[PDB]
Amino acid sequence: VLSSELPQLPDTYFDGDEQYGRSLFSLARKVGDRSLVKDTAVLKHAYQAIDPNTGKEYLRAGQSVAYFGASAGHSGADQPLVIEPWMQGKISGVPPPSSVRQFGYDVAKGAIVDLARPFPSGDYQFVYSDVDQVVDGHDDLSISSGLVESLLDSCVHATAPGGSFVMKINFPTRTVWHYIEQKILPNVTSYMLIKPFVTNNVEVFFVAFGVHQQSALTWTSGVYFFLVDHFYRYETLSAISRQLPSFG
Amino acid sequence: ANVWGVRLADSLSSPTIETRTRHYTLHDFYSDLDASVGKEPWRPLRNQRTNEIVAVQLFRPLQGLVFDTQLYGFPGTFSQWEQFMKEKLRVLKYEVLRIYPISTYNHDRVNVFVANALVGAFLSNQAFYDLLPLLIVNDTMISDLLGTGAALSQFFQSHGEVLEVAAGRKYLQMNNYSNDDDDPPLFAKDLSDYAKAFYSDTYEVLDRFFWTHDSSAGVLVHYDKPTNGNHYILGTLTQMVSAPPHIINATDALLLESCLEQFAANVRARSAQPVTRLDQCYHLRWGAQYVGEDSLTYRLGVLSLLATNGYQLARPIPKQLTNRWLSSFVSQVVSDGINETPLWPQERYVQIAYDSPSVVDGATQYGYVRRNQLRLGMRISALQSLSDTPAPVQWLPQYTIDQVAVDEGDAMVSQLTQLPLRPDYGSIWIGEALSYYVDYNRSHRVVLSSELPQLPDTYFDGDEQYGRSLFSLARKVGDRSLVKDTAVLKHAYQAIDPNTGKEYLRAGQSVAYFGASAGHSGADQPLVIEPWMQGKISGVPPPSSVRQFGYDVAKGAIVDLARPFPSGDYQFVYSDVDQVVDGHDDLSISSGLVESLLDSCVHATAPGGSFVMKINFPTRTVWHYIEQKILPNVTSYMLIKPFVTNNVEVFFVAFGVHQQSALTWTSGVYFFLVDHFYRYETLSAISRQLPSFGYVDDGSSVTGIEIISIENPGFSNMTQAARVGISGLCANVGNARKSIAIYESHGARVLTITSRRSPASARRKARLRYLPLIDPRSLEVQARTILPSNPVLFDNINGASPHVCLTMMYNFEVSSAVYDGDVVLDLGTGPEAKILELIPSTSPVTCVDIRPTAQPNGCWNVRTTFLELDYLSDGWITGVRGDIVTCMLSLGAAAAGKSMTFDAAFQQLVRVLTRSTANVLLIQVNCPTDVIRTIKGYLEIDQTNKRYKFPKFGRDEPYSDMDSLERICRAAWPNCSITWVPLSYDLRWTKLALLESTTLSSASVRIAELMYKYMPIMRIDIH
Amino acid sequence: TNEIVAVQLFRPLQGLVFDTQLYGFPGTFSQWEQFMKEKLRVLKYEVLRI
Amino acid sequence: FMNIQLISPIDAPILRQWAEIIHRYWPNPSQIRYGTPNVFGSANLFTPP
C-alpha cells in the first residue's frame, strides 16, 4: 500500500474541548512513572523480534547503546528510571547491555546537545530516542512535522553498522509517513511500530531493524488497520472524556 | 520581556473553570465549632529550616480577631494553643445551641459577619450576647446590620447605606517566630488593624462614599467573586518590615501577596481542574493620584495587572514563601529599568488584552472590560520546570555559518573571564609503578662498557629540579618504598637458574636488609618486611629471618655500609640505601660511594647468594667498575626499574655470587638504558610546560583552566555580545569537554562555562582566519538550576581508559609523521575530529566520513574539505589530491560493518588507493605480531572464527596474518617498502595526554601497551 | 586536652581594637561562632541596602 | 531606630523591647467628616473637603 492513503490525526485535535479531554484523563490516570511504564513496555517487545537474515535474533547482551532525551526531572537522582534496572538485568525479559550514554536537553550525566543538527559522537549498535517534538507543536503543525525528519536524519547516522533504533513520533502526519517511506523504509532490513497506551494521545513508536542494509520494503494493510484502530481509539476515549465532569 | 525583574517569556496561561460557592449555613457553623481532627479552621505554618511551627493561618468561622493579642491570652506553643481553642469553642457551641435549637438545621442561612464577630467577642470577653439574636439572616446580610447598634463598634459600624467592618488577623504569630530569613512572611496580617472593608449593595454608593472621605493610602477591589457581597478594601499606614533592606507599608504588602498568589496560580493551571477564583488580584481603584509614579505601589499595580492578564515569572515560586526569597523579589522589583509591557494601569477599569487566555471577562458581570485595541505578541501554554541536577553537566557546542573577527572574541572574554583564581591541582599520575625490566641473555651481542650512555649534564639545573619536584608533588601513591620493593621483589623470584633446572632461591633464606627508614609512623620497619614475612604478597615464598642495617634502623644495627663491619654472610641481601643526598653538583663523590658500597655488598653474600642494589646515578665509572669486577664473579644478572617517580635511578640484581664465570654486557641492556634515559627526557620536557602546584591562573600559561560567567535573565534570547564571548571560549579551547552550571549567585541568575585550554587547541586557533559563532539554541532552553563546584585542573580522577590511551598512541604517531606544509587526507573521522589539532597549522587537510560532520565550515587560514561518501566506493580519489592517507581505528569497523574479511577489506582499500597520487602513507591494520595471549577482561579473541570480541563495546573484527598481508603490497606496487613501527617503551606519546589535562593511569597504560601489540600500524612508501 | 582555647582572625574582621568587655563575646567557641554568624548577616543587610 | 535588628537581643536589655513597643503600639490616624459644603463651601487645602 502506498503512503498517501494512510490516515493522519484529525483537524479537531488542538481544540479546547479536546485539550480538556486529554488533560482530564491525564489527571485521572494513576501510574508510577510514565517514562518507566512506556520504556519497559517498548523494551520488552523490542527483544522478542528475530532476524530474517540469520536465524537467531537481532541483538544480544553487551550492546553499548545511546539514550536520547533524558529527563531525571522528578527526583530520580541522575537518570530516567529504566536505565539502572535495564543495566542490572532486573527486567528479566532483557539482556544487560555494556554501557549507556545519554544525550538531550535535560541530561544529568551525559552531554547536552541539539539532536537535530549533527554533533560529534560515535556510532552505536542500538540507540533509543524518545525526545518529544510537540512542545513547540501547538496550532502550527508544519514545524512539528518538520522537526521529525531532521531528528531521524541524525538518528539514522549514529547507528550505521548493522544497528537498530527506536524513535517516538508524537504527531503522525502525512509528510512524516511520506518521508519515512521515501528514505527510511528502503535502507532498513525490517521494521515495526508499537504503542503502549497509558495516556490518551496520538503518539506512536517507530522501531527499525538492520540499518544501512539495502533492501526493498513497503507499507501494509496491517499497518493500515493498526493506524485506523490507533486513531479511532483516541476518538472514542476523547468522546467519552468530554461527558465526564472536571477533576475537582 | 522584563519590567524591572525579569519574568518568563511567551507562554502565558490562566485558570479556565471557576467553581461556584454555597452559602454558609448553621449546619456548617455547628460543625466548625466542634473542630474534629479532620476538619478544623486553623492550619499551621512552619519554618523551612528548623521545621518548627511558627505561625497559624485562620479560616472561615474565626476571622474576627481584631483586638490586641494580650486581650485573648493565647498560649505560646501550637500544641497548647490548639487544645485551648478546641476547649473554648465547645463552650461557645453550647451557648449557640441553647438559644438556637438544632432542629432548625436544614436550609437556615447565618450571617457571616455576625458569625465572625461572635467568636471575636467571645474570645476577647466583650459583650457577645447582643449579637446572638442577629445570627439568622433575613432579606440580605448587610441591611440586617446597618440599622442596628448592638455589637461593639470595633467589629462593625454603619455610615448610612455603607457597612464598615474591620477585617483582622488572617495569620497568627506564635511564640518562636523570630523574623528569621527562613520564616514564612505574614504580609502585615498578624497585626490589629491592617485594612478596613466597606460593604454595600451597589458600587455607586461606595463611589459616592469615597468622594467625601479620603482615599489617601489607596483603595483595593476584588471584581471577581466577593466574599460576602461587593466591597472595597482600604489599607492603613502601618508597616511590616520583614525584609531588612526594605520597609513595606500595609497597602503594598496587601497587594503584593495577592499578586504572588496569582503568579503562582498561573503556573498550576492545567485546563481541567477548577479553582475558586479566576483571578486573585486587587487592582488599585481611586488612590492612584496620591500614590507616586514609578514607586513601589505603582510597580506592584503594574505587576498586579500582569498577573491578571496571565503572565508567568521567570524563576519559580516556592510552595511555601520564605522571608529571604520575598526580600530578594522586592529588591529585584525596586531596581531600575523601564516597563517593556504595553499594559498600563488605569483607575476607570482593569483591562484585559485580546489574546489573554483568561475567561473572567465573560464570567463576572462588570469591572473587567475586554479591551480590543492593545495586543501582545505571545502565545498561550504553561511553563515547563524541572529538577536541579546538582553536578555540573557536560555541554557540547554546535556551530553556525556566520562569523566575526578573531580580535573580537578575546577582547570580549577579557571582561567576562574571572581568570585570577586558584584552581585545585589534582594529580598527574595515579596507581602503582610500571615495571620495566631486562634480563641478560647468552646469544644477543657483546658490547663494551665505554659505549653505554650516562645521565646528561643538564640534570642538576633549576628547571630540571623543578620538573622533578612538580612530578613528585603531583604523584599520588601509598608508600614509595612499598611500591618499589614489592615490584622488585616479585620480579626477583620468577628468574630460574641455568646451573640446575628449578630456581635460584626458595623459602627460608635468612636475608639482610640495608637502609631501613621506618620514618612515617611505620612503627619499626619498612612496610614490606611484615607482609613478606607473612607471605601476603602471594608471589613470594616467606624467608626465615630478616636483619636490618643502615643509618635509620629501629630494630637492626646502625652501621656505615661503606666501611666493612662485623657481621655474617647471608644467602640474600637487599640494599636500597641512597647515595645521592650528598650527590648534588659534584658527581665524583656520588659515583665513588657506589663502588665502596658494592664491595661491602658482595662480601656479605658469598656462598651461592644473590643481591639487589639500587643505583641512583648510573655513570660511566660505575658501569666500568661493575664490568671490571662484579660482572665476572656472578652467574647471571639483570637490571630492572619500577617507575613511580621521574628520576634516573635503577636497580642492579646479581645472581650466583662468587661463581667464577664469564659475562659481558649486551645490546638489550644498551637499548634498555637508551629507553630509560629518554623516558626521563620526555617527561622532564613535559613537566616544565605545566604550571606549579598551588598556582593562581591568569590566562598567560599555555595549559590551564579558563571559565566565564555571563548572566541569563529568564527565557531571553542572548545578545551578540554573549554569543561572541561563548564563541571566543569555543575558539580559545577546542575539542575539550565543557561543563556548565546555572545558579542564582548574589540574587541574580548566572551561568558559567568551565573548560581547559591546551597547546593543541592553541595550534587549532591559528588555523582559522575568523572564528565561527555558536547557536544559542542549546542554552536558551535551560530553565533549571545546576549547582556548581570548585574548578580542578585534572578532572578525571579515575583515569584514562585503554581505548583513549591507545588513541593517544595513534595520534602521536600521526602528528610526528606529518611535517609542515603538506597536503594530507584523513581516512575516517573516529569519535571526534582530533586530526585538525594534530597536523601543523599551515597544512591543508581533507577528511572523509560516512556521517555529516559537525566542525564549522569556512573561514580558515588554509584549505579544508569535510565530506562523507562511504570511502569503500570507487571513483572519488581521482578528484581529490593529497600526499599521505591516515586510517586510524576505522578499517576494522568498515570490515565488521559489511561483514567481510580483513583481507578482502584491505584488498579493496589498496585497490582504491591505487588510483591515488600519494607516495607515503601509514594506515592502521589489526593483525597479531606476537604469540597471542588473549588478555582477560578487554580482548578475548577466537582462534577458529577469527574475531576480537571487545567486551567494553560489543564489537569484533577479523584478524589477518602479517604474511598474508605482506604479499598484497608486493602485488600492488613493485617499489613499495613496508615498515612495522614498534611500540616504544619510552612513553613518548604522552605529550598529547598530559598537556591536555588528563590524569592517565598506572595499569591502563600497561594494558594499552599490550593492546597495541595486537593492532600495530604500518607505514608504506613508494619510491 | 585537645580543647579550643584561642581563635585566629582573618581578612574581613581584623579591627577589634577596643576592649574585650565592649563586645560582649561568649566564652565558648560553639556559642561564639553562632553569635558571630548571627550578627554578620545583620551587618550584611545594612551594607546591601546602601 | 529605623531598623531594630541593629540593637542586640543577645545583650538582652530594654532598648530592643522599647523600640519594638514604639513600632507596635503607637496610635494611627483617622478621619471624622466635619463641614457642610452645600452652604458654607469648604476652606481646607491639601486634603479632600
Is the separation of the CB atoms in B617 and B580 below 8 Å?
Answer: yes
Resolution of the experimental model, in Å, one decimal: 3.4
Cβ <8 Å between A111 and B396: yes
β-bridge partners, B940: none
Cβ <8 Å between A112 and B778: yes
- Which three cell numbers, joined as nine digits, stand for B544? 626465615
Query: In angstroms, rounded to a whole number, what is the distance separating the alpha carbons of residues A127 and A64?
Result: 9
Q: Is B460 helix (H, G, I), strand (E, B) or coil?
A: coil
Cβ <8 Å between C39 and D8: yes
Residues in chain A within 8 Å Cβ distance of B777: 114
Is the separation of the CB atoms in B181 and B215 below 8 Å?
Answer: no
Least Cα separation, residue B401 to chain A (angstroms)? 13
Q: Is C34 helix (H, G, I), strand (E, B) or coil?
A: helix
List all residues of chain B from 161 to 180 with a beta carbon under 8 Å from chain D: 179
Is the separation of the CB atoms in A105 and A112 below 8 Å?
Answer: yes
**Among candidate residues B873, B905, B807, B1018, the one with its CA nearest the CA of residue A122:** B807
Residues in chain D within 8 Å Cβ distance of C42: 5-6
Query: In angstroms, rounded to a whole number, what is the distance separating the alpha carbons of residues A149 and A143?
Result: 11
Query: In angstroms, rounded to a whole number, what is the distance separating the alpha carbons of residues B806 and B808?
Result: 5
Q: Is B93 helix (H, G, I), strand (E, B) or coil?
A: helix
Cβ <8 Å between D3 and C39: no
A105 is in an annotated binding site: yes
Query: In angstroms, rounded to a whole number, what is the distance separating the alpha carbons of residues B416 and B722?
Result: 9
Q: Which 8-state DSSP code applies to residue B986?
A: T
CB neighbourhood size of D15 (10 A)? 12
Type of residue numbered B67: F
Which residues are CB-neighbours of A181 under 8 A, at least 6 positions away?
A2, A3, A218, A219
- Gyration radius of chain C's alpha carbons: 13
Which residues are CB-neighbours of B414 under 8 A, at least 6 positions away?
none
Which residues are CB-neighbours of A88 under 8 A, at least 6 positions away?
A96
What is the helix (H) or strand (E) element at residue B233, kind and residue range? strand B231-235
> What would the DSSP string read from start to end of chain A?
--GGGS----STTSSHHHHHHHHHHHHH---S-HHHHHHHHHHHHTTS---SSSSS-S--S---EEEE-----SS-SSS-TTHHHHHHTTTSSS---S-EEEESTT-SSSEE--SSS--S----SEEEE-----SS-SS-HHHHHHHHHHHHHHHHHTSTTT-EEEEEESS--HHHHHHIIIIIHHH-SEEEEE---SSSS--EEEEEESTT--------HHHHHHHHHHHHHHHHHHHHHHHS----
β-bridge partners, B613: B575, B652
Q: How far is CA A192 from CA A9, A130, B459, in A?
A: 20, 16, 69
Q: Is B761 helix (H, G, I), strand (E, B) or coil?
A: helix
Is the separation of the CB atoms in B258 and B281 below 8 Å?
Answer: yes
Nearest CA in chain B to C42: B244
> What would the DSSP string read from start to end of B924-958?
E-----SPP---TTT----SSS----BTTTTB---
Which residues are CB-neighbours of B372 under 8 A, at least 6 positions away?
B354
* B vs A contact (3+ beta-carbon pairs below 8 A): yes
Residues in chain C within 8 Å Cβ distance of D3: 46
Query: In angstroms, rounded to a whole number, what is the distance separating the alpha carbons of residues B635 and B496?
Result: 12
**What number of residues does chain A have?**
248
Q: Is B852 helix (H, G, I), strand (E, B) or coil?
A: coil
Least Cα separation, residue D3 to chain B (angstroms)? 7
Query: In angstroms, rounded to a whole number, what is the distance separating the alpha carbons of residues B110 and B102?
Result: 13
**Among candidate residues B259, B343, B351, the one with its CA nearest the CA of residue B296:** B259
What is the helix (H) or strand (E) element at residue B168, kind and residue range? none
* Phi, psi of B380, deg, nearest 5: -95, 130
Question: Three-state SS string across B237-278, please?
Answer: CCEECCCCCCCEEHHHHHHHHHHHHHHHHCCCCCCCCCECCC
Residues in chain B within 8 Å Cβ distance of D47: 214
Query: In angstroms, rounded to a whole number, what is the distance separating the alpha carbons of residues A116 and A151?
Result: 5
> What is the β-pairing status of strands B610-615 and B650-655?
antiparallel
Chain D interface, mutation test: which of B71, B154, B159, B238, most D Cβ atoms within 10 Å? B238
> What is the β-pairing status of strands B368-370 and B350-352?
parallel
Cβ <8 Å between C24 and D5: no
Cβ <8 Å between D3 and B241: yes
* A vs D contact (3+ beta-carbon pairs below 8 A): no
What is the helix (H) or strand (E) element at residue B156, kind and residue range? strand B156-158
> What's the burial of B599, exposed, middle or buried (CB within 10 Å: 0-12/13-18/19+)?
middle
> What is the β-pairing status of strands B636-643 and B434-439?
antiparallel
**Among candidate residues B270, B355, B253, B343, the one with its CA nearest the CA of residue B307:** B343
Is the separation of the CB atoms in A75 and B387 below 8 Å?
Answer: yes
Which residues are CB-neighbours of A220 under 8 A, at least 6 positions away?
A1
Q: How far is CA A105 from CA A109, A130, B779, in A?
A: 12, 12, 9
**Among candidate residues B647, B644, B645, the one with its CA nearest the CA of residue B676:** B647
CA B896 to chain centroid, in Å, comes to 36
The HSE-up count of residue B207 (CA atoms within 13 Å, CB side) is 6
- Which three cell numbers, joined as nine digits, stand for B539? 608471589
What is the helix (H) or strand (E) element at residue B657, kind and residue range? none
Nearest CA in chain C to B747: C48
- Which three cell numbers, joined as nine digits, stand for B761? 587547541
Is the separation of the CB atoms in B402 and B256 below 8 Å?
Answer: no
Phi-psi region of A212 (alpha: psi -120 to 50; beta: other; left: phi over 0): left
Virtual torsion, Cα B621, B623, B624, B626, nearest 10 deg = 120
Residue in this structure with the C-alpha cell 658501569, named with its chain if needed: B623
Q: How was this structure determined?
A: cryo-EM
CA B553 to chain centroid, in Å, comes to 48
Query: In angstroms, rounded to a whole number, what is the distance separating the alpha carbons of residues B215 and A77?
Result: 55
Please report, in angstroms and rounded to a whole number, the separation of the first and last CA atoms in chain A.
47
Residues in chain C within 8 Å Cβ distance of D7: none
Type of residue numbered B305: L
Residues in chain A within 8 Å Cβ distance of B396: 111-113, 119-120
Q: Does C48 touch chain D (CB under 8 A)?
A: no
**What number of residues does chain B have?**
1023
> What is the β-pairing status of strands A204-209 and B43-46?
unpaired
Q: Give strand ranges (E) for B275-374.
A: 350-352, 368-370
> What is the β-pairing status of strands A65-68 and B610-615?
unpaired
- Which three cell numbers, joined as nine digits, stand for B320? 511555601
CA B332 to chain centroid, in Å, comes to 28
